[model samples]
Target: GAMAPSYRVKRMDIAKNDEECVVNAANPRGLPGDGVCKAVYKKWPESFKNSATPVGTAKTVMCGTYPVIHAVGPNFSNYTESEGDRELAAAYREVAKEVTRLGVNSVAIPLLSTGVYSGGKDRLTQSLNHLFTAMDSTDADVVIYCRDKEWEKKISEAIQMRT
Candidate 1:
C-alpha cells in the first residue's frame, strides 16, 4: 500500500507550528489585512505583499524563517454556496501542489475565510472536508490549526461525522 498523508486538527498558534511550511489565508490583492494574512505579513517585507494572488491560487514567500504559502480563498458572501465550496477546495489543492513542488515535509494551515468571510458551522465543515481532500494528494504531514476551543471541538465533531 502507498504511504498516506496524516492529518490532525487542533487549537494552536500557527506561527509556532514548527513545520517546514505554513499557509495563510490571504486576500486576492495580497495586502496585509486582518487575520492570518496580517500575521504572516508582519514578518515579510512590504515589497512581498504587493503582488496579487488570484482566488484559488497560492503564492509562496519566505516569512523570515519558514516558507509561507499565501492562498486566496473565496469570499462566501459574493458567491452561491456551491461556488464557494469549489473555490475553497481549489485554494487548498493549490497549496498542496505548491508543497509538493517545494518538497516540503510538513505544513500547517488554518480554516481559511471562516473568520471574516462569514460562513457558519456548515461552511467550516465543508472547509475541513476540502482541506483534507486536497491534502490527501500530498506527501507532507498536515496540521489544521484553529483559533479557539469551540472550533477545535467543532472540527473534531466534523471529523467524527465524516468518519
Candidate 2:
C-alpha cells in the first residue's frame, strides 16, 4: 500500500517554515516577485537567485539549510479559468513529484499563483483542491502554509468538504 502523506493547513509564513523543503511560487521566467516568492528570494543566498522554471514544472534549488522547490504555476492574470486550472494542477503535481524524488520527509507549500499573480475565489478553491489532492499520494508530510487567516479557513472548509 502507498503511504499517505499527512496534511496540515496552517496560518503561517512559508519563508519561516522549518520543513525539510519549501515550495515557492515561480514564474515561467523563474523571477521572484511579490508574496512567497519575494520572501523566499530575499532569504535565499544571492547565488541561488536565478532559476528558469517553465510553467507547470518545478525546479529544486538549495537555500542553505533546506531546499526550495520553485514551482511555476499558471499566471491567471494572463490565463483563462480552464487554463489556470490545468496549470495549477500541474504545478502542484510537479511539486509533489519533485519533493518525493528528493526524498524529503516534510515540505511546506503556499497557495501558488493566487497572490500577486491574481486568481479569483473560484481559483482559490480549485487550487486548494488540486494541491491537497496531489499531496495525498506522496509519502512526505505536507504543510499548506497560508499567511492569511481567511485562506486558512477556506482551506479547512475545502478539506472538510472533500472528506
Q: Candidate 2 on 30-62: residue-level lDDT in tens?
A: 665777888878777441466777888888888
Index of the highest-TM-score prediction: 2
Structure candidate 2, residue pairs in collision: none
Clashes (N, CA, C under 3 Å) per candidate: 0, 0
| Global lDDT scores for all candidate models | 0.77, 0.79
Model 2 C-alpha lDDT versus the unseen true structure: 0.79
Q: Pick the candidate with the highest lDDT.
A: 2
State the lDDT of candidate 1 residue by residue for 1-163, as single tens digits: 1146566787877766767788888888878878777776765544254547888888887755567788888888886778877888899989988889878878889987688874543467778888888887688878788887888988877766756
Quote the lDDT for 43 in model 2.
74
Off by over 4 Å in 2: 1-4, 46-50, 119-122, 160-163
